[PDB]
Amino acid sequence: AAFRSVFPIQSYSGNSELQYVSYRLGEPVFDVQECQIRGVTYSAPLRVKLRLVIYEREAPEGTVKDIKEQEVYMGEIPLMTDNGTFVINGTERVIVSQLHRSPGVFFDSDKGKTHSSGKVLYNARIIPYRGSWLDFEFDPKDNLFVRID
């Protein structure tokens, strides 16, 4: 999901595009006992198979003159052990699960004084998982005011 989200990366309309093919995870060189002793993480490397395409000139959606598949490395993800723990630098860490507010519309009110008359001012709020916020707050004169972030 993350790869097919961010890939393919293309150039600045430079008739070249870096696309994603498939990935694969390596074997850990150290199991958990040896890597708790050794002080290193318990990780596994991802050899991502990539492919660099080159669109031709005078070819907006013409063919590619040059494609080249090359299995590249990047990063090293720590594998979760058989109990829910990681080994990070010799220690043993637990990623605590987080409870956050659900993205989407959210019709909160105000319900405070906030006016010196006690009128309530309803405001929508559109939270995404990623992106800019959006409110629609009312004004005390019954004006509807957007605000962005």
Partner: protein, 278 residues
């Protein structure tokens, strides 16, 4: 009324000069190199956008953006200082060298808090480029031994140059995540003695002076000028030979005699070599 941050004002400002054509650039340089300052002003004032374009690429190093822009400006001033129109070349090709190199030397100079020289930073960048190319061959972090293998250089040299890439930490950052404990709470003033060692030294000095005056005069004057202790200077056996007692061998003799008397005097107080030296 512009919003008054330094970057927006500058980037809005630099567009107030039309970019020059090739014959235009050559004519302005012809006027400039014979000492007409207006031509220099026009040539430097126009190609500021070149400096922002070149120093755009050098972002997100140690220097902030406007520092990179202003250091490229210095090289641009150097470039119009030494441009030749007689080669017929476009000015951008010649100035690109000067601006790119004087931002590169800026990042090599003004980044590290402990200033490493140029050649050490180029040598460290050689090794970091080698490690970046070596990481795709063995899919782990290349060691100091691995870089020393791939460059056939000694392992201690590459180890030293990588240890000179320390990324010197702050003090004021808190530790443990919770914002209650920075390095000022952890670090101890190591050069300043506390009151314990500072009173041991003064008590030892007074005890030494007391034991020396407990020793007879001819021995303790030799042992005083011998070490510079009792308000004297630390003199040679040849020096106190010519100064007090003419036989240097007898000065050694009275020194050994005084040292034996002081050995007895110290051990009468129970201070043996195990006592003073654990």
């Amino acid at each position: 009324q512009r919003v008054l941050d330094a970057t927006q004002l500058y980037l809005g400002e630099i567009g107030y000069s039309p970019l020059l054509t090739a014959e235009e650039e050559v004519y302005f340089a012809r006027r400039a190199l014979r000492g007409d300052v207006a031509s220099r002003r026009r040539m430097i004032e126009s190609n500021l956008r070149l400096v922002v374009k070149i120093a755009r690429r050098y972002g997100n190093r140690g220097l902030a953006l406007l520092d990179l822009i202003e250091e490229g400006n210095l090289g641009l001033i150097r470039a119009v200082e030494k441009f030749d129109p007689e080669r017929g070349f476009r000015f951008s090709t010649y100035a690109t060298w000067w601006i790119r190199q004087t931002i590169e030397r800026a990042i090599m100079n003004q980044t590290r808090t402990i200033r490493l020289p140029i050649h050490i930073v180029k040598e460290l960048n050689v090794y970091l480029r080698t490690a970046r190319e070596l990481s795709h061959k063995l899919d782990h972090e290349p060691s100091a031994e691995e870089i020393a293998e791939q460059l056939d250089k000694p392992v201690d040299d590459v180890s030293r140059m990588l240890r000179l890439n320390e990324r010197i930490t702050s003090v004021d950052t808190p530790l443990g995540g919770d914002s209650e404990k920075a390095l000022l709470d952890i670090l101890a003033d190591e050069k300043e003695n506390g009151p314990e060692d500072t009173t041991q030294d003064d008590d030892m000095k007074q005890s030494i002076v007391k034991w020396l005056f407990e020793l007879n005069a001819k021995q303790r004057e030799v042992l005083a000028r011998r070490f510079g202790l009792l308000g004297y200077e630390a003199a040679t056996l040849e020096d106190v030979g010519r100064e007090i007692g003419l036989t240097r061998e007898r000065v050694r003799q009275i020194q050994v005699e005084g040292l034996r008397r002081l050995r007895e005097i110290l051990q009468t107080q129970g201070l043996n070599i195990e006592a003073l030296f654990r």
